[PDB]
Amino acid sequence: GAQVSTQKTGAHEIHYTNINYYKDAASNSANRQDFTQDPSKFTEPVKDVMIKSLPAL
């Protein structure tokens, strides 16, 4: 029951193993490998979609 995943490196120029020892999910290590994001929530809160090229109004 071992997980193998890639580690942070560089663009031009790499595996580590992890095993859980405790029965409580709160004991796991931080899951700091997620990088998903979406700023449209705060930057485009309007109802009607506005095209950048077209005039605002």
Partner: protein
């Protein structure tokens, strides 16, 4: 079975040439509450550039994933005042300024916690210090709200049968533990604009929702011929964090541990005039 296996760079610039058309990306209207999405490619000629920069270090998980001190207190192994030989701290994250400001950038939080304790001891000054004392031991006890509270170092309550506790001996690594999400609500609330009584009276503010319990510490049985003082520091490290509803960072210095009270402050510093650039 024996093994089961389990990155998003910033947007790249794109070649842009001369343009002459009716489209006007530069012009917009901020009245809509919409932030313009223009890019440098839309106002000037640009070359093709590949960006390998990543926003990994800006994630909330990493931003809050650093242990920070939240409370420090001193207690003596022996003294005349009974209240001075042990500590009793109501849990709250508003005591230390730095982590308070870090947390107060979001309205609601939901995370697991990792607690680490650092304990150090020193001999009090005096006219006679020659003594020999074996290594000391310390007990940390957590009392959920409503549980019995010890009134002295040698009280019966220190015989925890359900209350979790840690026994630690000096010279070893600092003690550590994990705590899950223990809020009655669906998320921790840094702010609470409301009252306690339904008639809009009584306590006001985030003081109303603070019911996390207490922490007690004592020397297990050490009682030296001469006083010895110990200090304990508590560190919190959020894990598996989620946040909602960002807020503007605080501008004014903190003044109370359980209130938002403040004093008016200037917006920013001044300069000679609007044209000074030196």
């Amino acid at each position: 079975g024996d093994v089961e296996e389990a990155v998003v760079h910033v947007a790249d610039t794109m070649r842009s040439g001369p343009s002459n058309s009716a489209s006007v990306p530069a012009l917009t209207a901020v009245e809509t509450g919409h932030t313009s999405q223009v890019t440098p490619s839309d106002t000037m000629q640009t070359r093709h550039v590949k960006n390998y920069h990543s926003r990994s270090e800006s994630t909330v998980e990493n931003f809050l994933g650093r242990s920070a001190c939240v409370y420090m207190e001193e207690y003596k192994t022996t003294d005349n005042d009974v209240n001075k030989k042990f500590v009793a701290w109501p849990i709250n994250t508003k005591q230390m300024v730095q982590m308070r400001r870090k947390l107060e950038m979001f309205t609601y939080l939901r995370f697991d916690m990792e607690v680490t304790f650092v304990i150090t001891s020193r001999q009090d000054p005096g006219t006679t210090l020659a003594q020999d004392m074996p290594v000391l031991t310390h007990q940390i006890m957590y009392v959920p709200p409503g549980g019995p509270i010890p009134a002295k170092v040698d009280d019966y309550a220190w015989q925890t049968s359900t209350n979790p506790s840690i026994f630690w001996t000096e010279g070893n690594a600092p003690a550590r533990m994990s705590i899950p999400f223990i809020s009655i609500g669906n998320a921790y609330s840094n702010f609470y604009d409301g009252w306690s009584n339904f008639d809009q009276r009584g306590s006001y503010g985030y003081n109303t929702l603070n019911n996390l319990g207490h922490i007690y510490v004592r020397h297990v049985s050490g009682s030296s011929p001469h006083p010895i003082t110990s200090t304990i520091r508590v560190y919190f490290k959020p894990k598996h964090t989620r946040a909602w509803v960002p807020r503007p960072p605080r501008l004014c210095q903190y003044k109370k541990a359980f209130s938002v009270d403040f004093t008016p402050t200037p917006i920013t510093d001044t300069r000679k005039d609007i044209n000074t650039v030196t």
